[PDB]
Design a protein around this motif. Structure first.
Motif, PDB file in Angstrom:
ATOM      1  N   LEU A 159       0.834  -1.207   0.000  1.00  0.00           N
ATOM      2  CA  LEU A 159       0.000   0.000   0.000  1.00  0.00           C
ATOM      3  C   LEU A 159       0.856   1.238   0.000  1.00  0.00           C
ATOM      4  O   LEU A 159       0.567   2.130  -0.800  1.00  0.00           O
ATOM      5  N   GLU A 160       1.937   1.249   0.832  1.00  0.00           N
ATOM      6  CA  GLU A 160       2.683   2.507   0.954  1.00  0.00           C
ATOM      7  C   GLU A 160       3.842   2.624  -0.047  1.00  0.00           C
ATOM      8  O   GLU A 160       4.716   3.514   0.029  1.00  0.00           O
ATOM      9  N   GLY A 161       3.891   1.681  -0.986  1.00  0.00           N
ATOM     10  CA  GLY A 161       4.822   1.773  -2.103  1.00  0.00           C
ATOM     11  C   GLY A 161       6.164   1.125  -1.748  1.00  0.00           C
ATOM     12  O   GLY A 161       6.327   0.458  -0.690  1.00  0.00           O
ATOM     13  N   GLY A 162       7.111   1.306  -2.661  1.00  0.00           N
ATOM     14  CA  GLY A 162       8.376   0.580  -2.632  1.00  0.00           C
ATOM     15  C   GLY A 162       9.151   0.664  -3.956  1.00  0.00           C
ATOM     16  O   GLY A 162       8.741   1.391  -4.905  1.00  0.00           O
ATOM     17  N   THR A 163      10.242  -0.125  -4.004  1.00  0.00           N
ATOM     18  CA  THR A 163      11.137  -0.128  -5.135  1.00  0.00           C
ATOM     19  C   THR A 163      11.198  -1.569  -5.623  1.00  0.00           C
ATOM     20  O   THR A 163      11.517  -2.508  -4.849  1.00  0.00           O
ATOM     21  N   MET A 164      10.845  -1.718  -6.908  1.00  0.00           N
ATOM     22  CA  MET A 164      10.927  -3.043  -7.504  1.00  0.00           C
ATOM     23  C   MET A 164      12.252  -3.163  -8.253  1.00  0.00           C
ATOM     24  O   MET A 164      12.516  -2.317  -9.115  1.00  0.00           O
ATOM     25  N   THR A 165      13.115  -4.131  -7.878  1.00  0.00           N
ATOM     26  CA  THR A 165      14.411  -4.332  -8.521  1.00  0.00           C
ATOM     27  C   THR A 165      14.348  -5.536  -9.458  1.00  0.00           C
ATOM     28  O   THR A 165      13.865  -6.609  -9.049  1.00  0.00           O
ATOM     29  N   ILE A 166      14.799  -5.351 -10.704  1.00  0.00           N
ATOM     30  CA  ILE A 166      14.835  -6.424 -11.688  1.00  0.00           C
ATOM     31  C   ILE A 166      16.273  -6.865 -11.909  1.00  0.00           C
ATOM     32  O   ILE A 166      17.083  -5.999 -12.226  1.00  0.00           O
ATOM     33  N   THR A 167      16.611  -8.152 -11.733  1.00  0.00           N
ATOM     34  CA  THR A 167      17.991  -8.610 -11.967  1.00  0.00           C
ATOM     35  C   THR A 167      18.031  -9.688 -13.044  1.00  0.00           C
ATOM     36  O   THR A 167      17.298 -10.685 -12.936  1.00  0.00           O
ATOM     37  N   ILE A 204      12.181   0.232 -10.546  1.00  0.00           N
ATOM     38  CA  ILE A 204      10.930   0.986 -10.724  1.00  0.00           C
ATOM     39  C   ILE A 204      10.551   1.480  -9.326  1.00  0.00           C
ATOM     40  O   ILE A 204      10.513   0.668  -8.390  1.00  0.00           O
ATOM     41  N   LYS A 205      10.253   2.782  -9.184  1.00  0.00           N
ATOM     42  CA  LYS A 205       9.846   3.335  -7.901  1.00  0.00           C
ATOM     43  C   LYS A 205       8.345   3.639  -7.874  1.00  0.00           C
ATOM     44  O   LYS A 205       7.752   4.163  -8.803  1.00  0.00           O
ATOM     45  N   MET A 206       7.708   3.170  -6.815  1.00  0.00           N
ATOM     46  CA  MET A 206       6.274   3.361  -6.618  1.00  0.00           C
ATOM     47  C   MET A 206       6.016   4.006  -5.258  1.00  0.00           C
ATOM     48  O   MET A 206       6.408   3.462  -4.198  1.00  0.00           O
ATOM     49  N   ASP A 207       5.323   5.161  -5.300  1.00  0.00           N
ATOM     50  CA  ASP A 207       5.025   5.865  -4.046  1.00  0.00           C
ATOM     51  C   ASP A 207       3.878   5.221  -3.323  1.00  0.00           C
ATOM     52  O   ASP A 207       3.730   5.451  -2.154  1.00  0.00           O
ATOM     53  N   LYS A 208       3.096   4.410  -4.020  1.00  0.00           N
ATOM     54  CA  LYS A 208       1.945   3.741  -3.451  1.00  0.00           C
ATOM     55  C   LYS A 208       1.524   2.626  -4.430  1.00  0.00           C
ATOM     56  O   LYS A 208       1.937   2.665  -5.618  1.00  0.00           O
ATOM     57  N   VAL A 209       0.793   1.661  -3.893  1.00  0.00           N
ATOM     58  CA  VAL A 209       0.117   0.648  -4.684  1.00  0.00           C
ATOM     59  C   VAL A 209      -1.359   0.682  -4.364  1.00  0.00           C
ATOM     60  O   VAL A 209      -1.727   0.254  -3.251  1.00  0.00           O
ATOM     61  N   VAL A 210      -2.154   1.034  -5.392  1.00  0.00           N
ATOM     62  CA  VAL A 210      -3.570   1.324  -5.157  1.00  0.00           C
ATOM     63  C   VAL A 210      -4.355   0.034  -5.109  1.00  0.00           C
ATOM     64  O   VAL A 210      -5.231  -0.110  -4.255  1.00  0.00           O
TER      65      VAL A 210
END
Ligand SMILES: [Cu+2]
Ligand SMILES: [Cu+2]
Ligand SMILES: [Cu+2]
Ligand SMILES: [Cu+2]
Ligand SMILES: [Cu+2]
Ligand SMILES: [Cu+2]
Lengths: 464, 464
Positions: free
Chosen positions: B172-180, B287-293
Motif C-alpha cells: 500500500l505505501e509503495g516501494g522499489t521493484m528491482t529487476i535482476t 521501478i519506484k512506486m510511491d503507493k500501490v492502489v
C-alpha cells in the motif's frame, strides 16, 4: 444441443476408477458435470492404482452415497508400457471406503489397513447391499466383509498343485485345487496380508494375459501354484456366491450361510458342467482336475438368478451358460448353452465384462483385443443365447453398467493406460452408440450408483 | 446422438492439466474421445500438481503435437482444504515437455531438471511458436526458453523493497521493484532453483491472496519482498513481452531483442499509464512506486497487438485497457478505457482469465468467486469496452480458450479441487452455453492445439 442429449439419460451417477490415473470420479449423466473426484496420491498413497469398485444402495445418490474402491501396488506399475524410472513403487493393495456427501468425496477408511487383507482385484457388493467381497489374483485370496463393522466375515486361500510341475504344462495337464478357510494370524483378529505380502506372482495377469504365466513371462516365488482368483459374484436370490479362478477355468460355488464350497463349475466347452468338492480337513476342500482345456475370466449371474455365465478365453473365446434355476441345489446346475462366433476363433477377441438388461432379455458383453484392433460390445439375446450384434467402440474396452430403468448401457474404454479412453453410451432399444464422453481414466471398472437392492441385480454384485 | 453435437465444434484438440489430479490429457472435441493422458505420479513425481501449459503450432495436431506443462509442489498441496495427513510433500516445480505422437503422450524431458529453473506459474508460448516462458510468483523469477535446445534464453528475478516494512503496509505505501538478469551458478550452465529453492513464500497467492499475505496468513522467509510474478505474455506483433507482478499491480514491459525492461504499466484506475524503468548496474533495473492502489492479475494482448488488458483485483475489480498501437515505443502506451460494473463493487468476482475472438471484436473474461457463489463468464465488447453479458457456469471457473475459426469458447471449472468440475462450451454467436463435458480435473489452464503461428494470437501466448 447438449441439455437435450443428457436429459434423456435420467438422473443416474456414473462412478469410475482411473487405474494409472490414480483417481475416482462421479459424473452426473443427467447434466454431464463431474460431481466430484479424488486423487489417491493427494492422501499419501504413492501407488494408487485404482482398480475395482462397487457402490451400495442409497435412497438419493445425489445427496449422498458410499462405495468401496481398491488399489493394486508393487510391480503392477511396470506392466502397461509406461517407461517410468521408479525404483521402489508403493506397496498398494488398499481397500478404501469413500462417501459422497452431496458436494465432495470423503475418504472414510482403509479397510485393508484395518483388517490386514490387501486384495487388489474385483470388488462386489452383496445382494442386500450391507457387505462386499474382494478377491486377488496374485495372492489367490478372497474375503467377504461386513460394511457396518468393517470386518471380515470369511477369508479363503485357493492353491494349485500341478500334476506336471513343468510351468508350460502346470495347468494343461491338470492338478489339485485346494481351498482353505483362513484365520487371522496377527493380534486384534488382523490378517497378515497388507501390501505385497502373500503374492505368488509379482504382478497381476493382465487383460488378455492369462497364459503369460505358463509362457514364463511373470516372475514370482510360487508361479505354478497360482489359480488367479478374480471375483466373487453373487447369486441375486441370495445364499450362493461364485468364485472365479482364471487359470483352471473354474467357478467355485460357495454357501455363504456356512461358508463352504459346494461345487465347482468347469468353464470349457466340451468338459463336464462341474466337478465335486471333497472336504479333506475341518477347513480344507479339494477339487481334482485331470486337465484344464482353457482359462476363463469374467463371470456373472442373470438378474433372476436362473443363468450363470463364465467367459472362456484365449484357448476358447465363448460365453458358457449354466442353468442355475434350481436355487436349492447348485450340484443340479448344468451347462445349457454356449455362445460362439466364427470371428472369435483366434486368440482374441476375448468375451469380457458384462451387464444384463433388468428384464433379463439381453446381455451386453465386451470384446477385448490387444492394440490396435478396435474393441467393442457384443449384444447377446439371453433367451436363445445367440449373438445379435457387435459394435466397435475403441481401444481396450472394459466394464459395462446399465441405467436401472434399462434404457442405456454405459461402458468405458481405457487405452491400455496410454491411448484413447472414453465413456460410451448405448441405447438399449436401437443397440446403437448414442455417444462418447471424454474420460481421463484407465478404468477397469464402472458402476451406476444404485437406489435399491433390486438395482444391484444389474450392478457390480451379480457380474463383473 | 452427440455425434451431431461434436461435428459442429470442428477438428480441435483441447489439452487440460489436472491440478490435484496429477494428470494432463488431450480430448478430441470432434468425437468426444480423450486421445491420450499421462499421470505425473506414475513417473516418480510424488507431488504432480499439474498447473499451467502451452502448446506449439503443429500442421496436423491429430498426427502429433508438443506442449509444455509445469507443476507446483511443497505446501501448495495443503491450500485447497483436502484433509491429507501428508507431512513432507514432494518439492515439485517441474517443467515437462510432452509430445503426442498420434497414439500416446511421451514425456520427452524435464526442462526444470535440465536447466535448473523450477517455475510453477504461467507457461506461455512465444508468437513464433519456437520458445516458451515460465514465471513463478513464490520465487518471483521468470525465464524464456528455446524449445529446440531446451535451454534458457534469459532469466530474471524481481524483488520488492517496501517503503514501510510493516507487512500490512508493505505494498500500500509503495516501494522499489528491482529487476535482476540472472546468470547460472552451477556447472553445465545450470541454475540453482530446482524444487522449492528460491521461494520467498511457501505457496502461490490464492485469488484475493494479497490481503492474506498482508494479513500475515502466508508463511515464508521473505514475505515483504514478494511481487508475485504471474505471467510473461507476448505482444503478437513480436519484440515485447509483459511480465505481470500481482502485488504491485504492474506489468513490466521487456524488450525481447536486448532483454531489458523498458517501462512499467500501472494497473489501478486513476494512476499513471506507466512509470519509468532505470538501469542501475549492468544487470539491474529499478521501478519506484510511491503507493500501490490495488493488486492486479490477468493480463493480455488483443490479437492485433493494439490493446493490452490488465485486470485490477481486490481493491478495484475492473479491466484496464491500454492503447498499445505504437509498436515502436511502449513508453507511449496509454490507458484508453476501463471496464467497470456495479456488480464488480465487492471483493469478488475477480475478472481473471481471458480469450479474444480472432477478429478482436469480443473478449471473454472469467468471473471467479470463492465457494459457494456460482462462477461464470463475462462477455466484453472489445471495440467500445463495455460489459455485454455475464453467464453463470459452475464452481471455481478457470481458463478460456477458443476454437481458431472463432466459433466456440471452451472453458474449464474445477470445483476448488473437491466439488463439481467440467469443460464448458459456449457458442460465440449467441454467447450461450451449448453445454458441459465431464472432466476429472482441477485444471487452472486449458489450450486448444494450434495449427499456425496466427492461432497462437488467441492461445496461451498473448493472454493467460
Ligand atoms: Cu476380472
Ligand atoms: Cu476390465
Ligand atoms: Cu483390471
Ligand atoms: Cu495467473
Ligand atoms: Cu485459473
Ligand atoms: Cu493454480
Amino acid at each position: 444441443k447438449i441439455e437435450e442429449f443428457y436429459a434423456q439419460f435420467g438422473k443416474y451417477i456414473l462412478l469410475v476408477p482411473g487405474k494409472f490415473t490414480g483417481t475416482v470420479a462421479a459424473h452426473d449423466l443427467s447434466t454431464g458435470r463431474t460431481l466430484a473426484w479424488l486423487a489417491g496420491w493427494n492422501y499419501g498413497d504413492t501407488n494408487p492404482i485404482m482398480h475395482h469398485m462397487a457402490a451400495f444402495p442409497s435412497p438419493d445418490p445425489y445427496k449422498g452415497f458410499e462405495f468401496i474402491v481398491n488399489t493394486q501396488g508393487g510391480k503392477n506399475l511396470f506392466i502397461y508400457g509406461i517407461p517410468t524410472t521408479v525404483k521402489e513403487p508403493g506397496e498398494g493393495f488398499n481397500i478404501y471406503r469413500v462417501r459422497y456427501d452431496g458436494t465432495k468425496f470423503n475418504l472414510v477408511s482403509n479397510i485393508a489397513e484395518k483388517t490386514g487383507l490387501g486384495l487388489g482385484v474385483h470388488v462386489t457388493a452383496t445382494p442386500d447391499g450391507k457387505g462386499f467381497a474382494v478377491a486377488d489374483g496374485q495372492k489367490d485370496i478372497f474375503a467377504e466383509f461386513d460394511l457396518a463393522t468393517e470386518s471380515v466375515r470369511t477369508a479363503f486361500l485357493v492353491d494349485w498343485k500341478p500334476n506336471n510341475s513343468d510351468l508350460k504344462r502346470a495347468w494343461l495337464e491338470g492338478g489339485t485345487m485346494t481351498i482353505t478357510r483362513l484365520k487371522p494370524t496377527l493380534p486384534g483378529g488382523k490378517y497378515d496380508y497388507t501390501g505385497t505380502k502373500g503374492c505368488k506372482i509379482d504382478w497381476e495377469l493382465v487383460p488378455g494375459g492369462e497364459l503369460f504365466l505358463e509362457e514364463g513371462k511373470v516372475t514370482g516365488t510360487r508361479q505354478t501354484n497360482v489359480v488367479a482368483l478374480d471375483a466373487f459374484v453373487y447369486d441375486p436370490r441370495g445364499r450362493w456366491g461364485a468364485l472365479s479362478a482364471r487359470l483352471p477355468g473354474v467357478a467355485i460355488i460357495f454357501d455363504r450361510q456356512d461358508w463352504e464350497p459346494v461345487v465347482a463349475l468347469v468353464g470349457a466347452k466340451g468338459e463336464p458342467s462341474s466337478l465335486p468338492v471333497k472336504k479333506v480337513a475341518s477347513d480344507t476342500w479339494e477339487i481334482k482336475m485331470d486337465k484344464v482345456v482353457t482359462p476363463a475370466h469374467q463371470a456373472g449371474f442373470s438378474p433372476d438368478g436362473k443363468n450363470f455365465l463364465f467367459m472362456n478365453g484365449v484357448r476358447q473365446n465363448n460365453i458358457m451358460v449354466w442353468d442355475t434355476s434350481n436355487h436349492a441345489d447348485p450340484t443340479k446346475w448344468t451347462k445349457k448353452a454356449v455362445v460362439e462366433d466364427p470371428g472369435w476363433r483366434g486368440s482374441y477377441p476375448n468375451t469380457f465384462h458384462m451387464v444384463f438388461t433388468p428384464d433379463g432379455r439381453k446381455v451386453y458383453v465386451t470384446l477385448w483385443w490387444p492394440s490396435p484392433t478396435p474393441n467393442g460390445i457384443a449384444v447377446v439375446d439371453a433367451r436363445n443365447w445367440k449373438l445379435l450384434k457387435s459394435v466397435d467402440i475403441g481401444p481396450d474396452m472394459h466394464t459395462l453398467a446399465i441405467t436401472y430403468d434399462g434404457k442405456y448401457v454405459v461402458g468405458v474404454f481405457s487405452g491400455y493406460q496410454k491411448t484413447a479412453s472414453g465413456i460410451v453410451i448405448m441405447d438399449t432399444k436401437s443397440d446403437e452408440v448414442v455417444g462418447i464422453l471424454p474420460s481421463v481414466g484407465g478404468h477397469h471398472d464402472c458402476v451406476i450408483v444404485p437406489k435399491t437392492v433390486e438395482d444391484l441385480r444389474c450392478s457390480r454384485c451379480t457380474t463383473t
